[PDB]
Write a protein that binds this ligand. Structure first.
Ligand SMILES: O=C(O)C1=C[C@H](O)[C@@H](OS(=O)(=O)O)[C@H](O[C@H]2[C@H](O)[C@@H](NS(=O)(=O)O)[C@@H](O[C@H]3[C@H](O)[C@@H](OS(=O)(=O)O)[C@H](O[C@H]4[C@H](O)[C@@H](NS(=O)(=O)O)[C@@H](O[C@H]5[C@H](O)[C@@H](OS(=O)(=O)O)[C@H](O[C@H]6[C@H](O)[C@@H](NS(=O)(=O)O)[C@@H](O)O[C@@H]6COS(=O)(=O)O)O[C@H]5C(=O)O)O[C@@H]4COS(=O)(=O)O)O[C@H]3C(=O)O)O[C@@H]2COS(=O)(=O)O)O1
Ligand SMILES: O=C(O)C1=C[C@H](O)[C@@H](OS(=O)(=O)O)[C@H](O[C@H]2[C@H](O)[C@@H](NS(=O)(=O)O)[C@@H](O[C@H]3[C@H](O)[C@@H](OS(=O)(=O)O)[C@H](O[C@H]4[C@H](O)[C@@H](NS(=O)(=O)O)[C@@H](O[C@H]5[C@H](O)[C@@H](OS(=O)(=O)O)[C@H](O[C@H]6[C@H](O)[C@@H](NS(=O)(=O)O)[C@@H](O)O[C@@H]6COS(=O)(=O)O)O[C@H]5C(=O)O)O[C@@H]4COS(=O)(=O)O)O[C@H]3C(=O)O)O[C@@H]2COS(=O)(=O)O)O1
Lengths: 515, 516
């Protein structure tokens, strides 16, 4: 056996250093990785080690049952919406994600808000119940024995609130004072919540020990409409006046990290900083607080925040307008502020339908019903409908001029229409049902146009514009697969099963046969 | 740390293969890579240091030298070798053109293949050095005893003046059971043999061939029958018909030998490594006359005119060259019954005929080219070649299937033919071809991205028409696609041709369309 070095000429161009063993040649994975865009690592278990090679990075969702409107949303149980770079932060006023853009403010992007709600809804169904720790349940025999710290000009007393039929804390602390504080001490869970009613300006601050060396970070939830601020180790979120009773719920993990990575660009700076201990809370101003709680998760609160945001922000045409200009790419006219997205409409429908089924609150269903509005108008008339080669109706993720035909957004619009049609019943759902079934006809014919024989294409701009195919990155390919296998459980066309099979093989280096 | 290790490589959680580990680097076996990535590579020893040469593809793009025009080389066909294709059964003895293989002992005439044969020989005539040409039996013996020929008893071989032919020729007589009259040749360099011939009975001209195979020479018999091709031991037989009026027979002994040795009753001629080594002699049986016995390196124009004349003589009343075998393109397409036309056949013929007309000014070639336009005007289902993509774009079908298939390469070849014709026939007569061409070019420009996978090309649009997997084009079809676009780019200034060529070329080296 002699394992020596052999020079490898690559396409008659560059030379790299390989290995040989007689007639057999071995090529360095460090070159393969970049040349083929593939993945691998040496993984070492207890008595031996192994190189694990992977053609791609994403995985297909393992479906457990037929898809249905009131269950998990496709694969969103495994989605983490809030860690996305383009999520600037969770709004203190709205409790929903804002998207990044150029400049200090964010914009509300209904797609992102709906995905936030849908994933939290889905996780509520699949995860174990959270650990819930309630604080300040001990009743001091007198003020001196209180768990609270009440400095010089401050007040903190327990009062029976007849209207709420419970005891609450009435607090008072001048804004320049240290404020009244309650030790917390949680090292495991990072979702904080409390019932709150302010009668002046003030704030609730949470002191956070972190993996960063030095002083703790402090997150201030203040009675302003300010989005988010970072100054040294002080992070600030405006939560509004809070002059009527509400339950405030905050993910300290997300709030901390979005604060640290705050910038005026399209991408939040990634941080490896993690919370280690929720130290205490500090209150300034006057009002009342109750039910101070730290939980592992609080999924339904986030779901309803998204659902209620959607109800409140739907416009008179039934749409959620994207209030920034979007320029999809060279060849496509800019979309001016106020444009709709078929994906936004559909994802909103899926969220609203679920909220309606949980509560029986008609306003969720009415909102979903109105959302079909833009589907009936062409892209150029402030709608979402495109037509492929004068023949096939399509619902646009981006209603561009000329049309773009993005696959994944189209399918999400169909899932949304399905959720609606199935839930509204025969009479009220006919409209959504008609739009759905017509879209499904288009999808079944057009699907092969997105198949490259080793992956999928994102959209049809190569054909519409006369340019290179806009290939889908692996996790969009994985979205396509998850989407088709979902449809496969609610529509028996062989096209979905045949396409799912072949598209899955692409993840494992499979390809269509050549002649 | 670890300095050399046979390491388990788990591939996508399925199979396990053996790599090598050396420090932080892992090396993977090319024997797996080759089949897994569908790539190519070989160890090439250099004088001093040998090297592994890796390639993403095979095949090359043609290096064009000038703007394309109708009387010059045909695309890249100067580098084509049509005769060695496994599906060329042989060169017909009667017609001097290739027959295609099929199931059974027979072959059929395939106009695409015949046109490509002519076009490549035409192109080689323009690019290769002129052949060496050796004429035999030019010496005039003073008497019969001193003849260069061997004349066994009961046979005769005399030089006579042939008045009609206005030249001196050899008159032969040799019974079929005899050894025949023979003439030594002795050529070790060149293997295209030709002779002027006129039989007055049944007989044959046989050529004794020494080869790289050990044992006795092979003998090729050119006999006065219409039999296609025979093999028995070292005798290969071709029927060349009656030959009762004077003609020039021209045979490629290299091709004739190999097709003989590899003779089968299947779709695929068996490959051989046997090569001719020496043309020993020719032997003649029967009665008749022979003249101008010659061996040349090449005889390109003879092959070109054989192809051109076949096209003229075999075009039907509707201007088409009908394919007389059934072709079943694949699952989902109806069988094409005998008699179907092909846009590629029509166009490749136009390109050949136009070239024949420009060399000779013989109107028969231009008329045939002009009429070849017929099938383009009729839908596939009505014995034509026209398909329509999504109710909008006219297309000319290499395979006029039901439903339509939209093969890219055959379409473009049909366009090149229409161009050749439109450019050659003039304004008035060429109007028809000109219209078909420009209508097809408009379709091509719109539909072209449908064939682009972001890393290769698709052969046709069956994936969309049938709802199935894309039928990916193998590398030498991808390379045809590129060659065709760069040709069109010299006669049409649309940026689409340039942009697509540039990207499609990058695919050959592992380039790809960007993903999001
Ligand atoms: O959570 C998940 O794991 C997850 C997975 C799934 O993918 C998906 O879930 S699903 O269920 O919906 O399927 C979902 O994806 C989210 C991502 O995880 C998340 N990534 S993040 O990094 O964590 O934030 C995110 O992704 C978006 C990001 O912007 C970015 O991600 S990243 O990893 O690359 O950083 C990525 O951007 C893509 C973009 O999608 C491509 N667009 S295209 O239409 O497909 O071609 C693309 O856009 C480029 C163009 O190339 C460029 O054109 S140009 O010709 O080169 O110039 C153009 O430039 C614009 C310029 O930006 C314009 N600004 S504007 O006016 O404000 O619109 C203007 O200046 O004009 C230029 C064009 O001018 S021109 O018309 O004259 O030509 O746009 C840029 C562009 O960045 O937009 O290529 C980029 C990659 O860029 S790069 O890094 O290679 O340079 O993917 C984005 C995306 O997928 O949307 O957000 C995902 C959705 O999350 S959420 O919003 O629903 O919460 O989650
Ligand atoms: O000289 C060159 O270098 C050169 C390069 C360029 O490529 C080209 O030049 S250009 O300027 O025109 O561009 C030109 O190419 C020639 C080749 O070099 C030459 N190769 S050769 O080996 O030297 O002879 C030759 O190529 C043809 C050969 O048949 C073959 O080549 S090989 O290397 O594979 O041996 C190859 O066949 C392909 C074929 O093209 C594919 N067709 S497809 O439409 O693209 O999908 C394909 O056909 C298969 C199908 O997969 C099969 O379908 S099935 O679903 O699997 O069953 C189907 O089976 C039929 C059956 O054959 C039928 N018989 S029939 O009734 O007589 O029609 C019937 O039984 O029904 C079945 C279908 O039933 S069903 O409807 O129910 O489904 O057809 C077969 C089939 O073989 O036809 O896949 C094969 C590869 O097969 S395999 O080996 O992987 O198994 O390529 C052929 C081709 O390209 O035409 O000839 C080329 C042109 O030369 S010439 O004629 O102009 O002189 O030169």
């Amino acid at each position: 056996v002699r394992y020596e070095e052999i020079d490898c000429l690559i396409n008659d161009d560059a030379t790299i250093k390989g290995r040989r063993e007689g007639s057999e040649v071995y090529m360095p994975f460090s070159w393969m990785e970049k040349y083929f865009e593939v993945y691998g690592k040496v993984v070492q278990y207890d008595g031996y080690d192994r190189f694990e090679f992977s053609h791609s990075y994403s995985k297909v969702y393992a479906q457990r049952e037929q898809y249905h409107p009131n269950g998990v949303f496709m694969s969103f149980e495994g989605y983490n919406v809030e860690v996305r770079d383009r999520v600037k932060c969770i709004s203190g006023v709205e409790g929903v994600p804002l998207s990044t853009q150029w400049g200090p403010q964010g914009y509300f992007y209904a797609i992102q808000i709906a995905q936030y709600g849908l994933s939290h809804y889905s996780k509520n169904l699949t995860e174990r119940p959270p650990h819930v720790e309630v604080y300040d349940t001990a009743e001091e025999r007198d003020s001196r024995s209180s768990a609270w710290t009440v400095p010089k000009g401050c007040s903190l007393t327990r009062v029976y609130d007849k209207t709420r039929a419970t005891s609450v804390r009435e607090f008072s602390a001048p804004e320049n004072s240290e404020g009244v504080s309650l030790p917390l001490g949680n090292t495991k869970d990072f979702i904080i919540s409390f019932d709150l009613k302010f009668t002046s300006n003030g704030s609730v601050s949470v002191i956070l020990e972190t993996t960063e060396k030095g002083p703790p970070f402090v997150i201030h939830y203040v009675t302003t409409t300010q989005l988010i601020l970072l100054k040294d180790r002080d992070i600030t979120y405006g939560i509004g006046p809070r002059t009527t009773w509400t339950t405030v719920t905050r993910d300290l993990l997300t709030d901390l990290r979005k604060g640290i990575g705050l910038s005026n660009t399209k991408a939040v700076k990634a941080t490896k900083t993690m919370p280690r201990r929720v130290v205490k809370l500090v209150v300034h101003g006057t009002g009342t607080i109750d039910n101070i709680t730290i939980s592992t998760t609080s999924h339904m609160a986030a779901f309803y925040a998204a659902s209620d945001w959607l109800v409140r922000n739907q416009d008179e045409r039934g749409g959620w307008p994207i209030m920034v200009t979007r320029k999809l790419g060279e060849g496509f006219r800019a979309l001016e502020p106020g444009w709709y997205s078929a994906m936004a409409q559909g994802q909103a429908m899926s969220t609203l339908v679920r909220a309606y089924l949980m509560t029986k609150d008609d306003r969720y269903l009415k909102a979903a019903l109105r959302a079909t509005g833009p589907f009936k108008l062409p892209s150029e008339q402030h709608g979402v409908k495109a037509v492929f080669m004068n023949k096939y109706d399509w619902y646009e993720e981006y209603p561009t001029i000329p049309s773009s035909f993005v696959l994944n957004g189209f399918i999400y619009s169909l899932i949304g229409l399905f959720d609606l049609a199935q839930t509204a019943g025969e009479k009220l759902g006919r409209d959504a049902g008609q739009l759905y079934s017509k879209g499904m006809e288009s999808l079944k014919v057009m699907l092969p146009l997105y198949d490259t024989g080793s992956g999928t294409i994102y959209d049809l701009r190569h054909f519409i514009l006369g340019t290179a195919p806009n290939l889908a990155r692996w996790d969009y390919h994985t979205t396509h697969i998850n989407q088709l296998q979902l449809l496969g459980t609610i529509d028996n066309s062989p096209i979905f099963r045949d396409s799912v099979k072949r598209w899955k093989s692409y993840l494992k280096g499979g390809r269509a046969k050549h002649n």
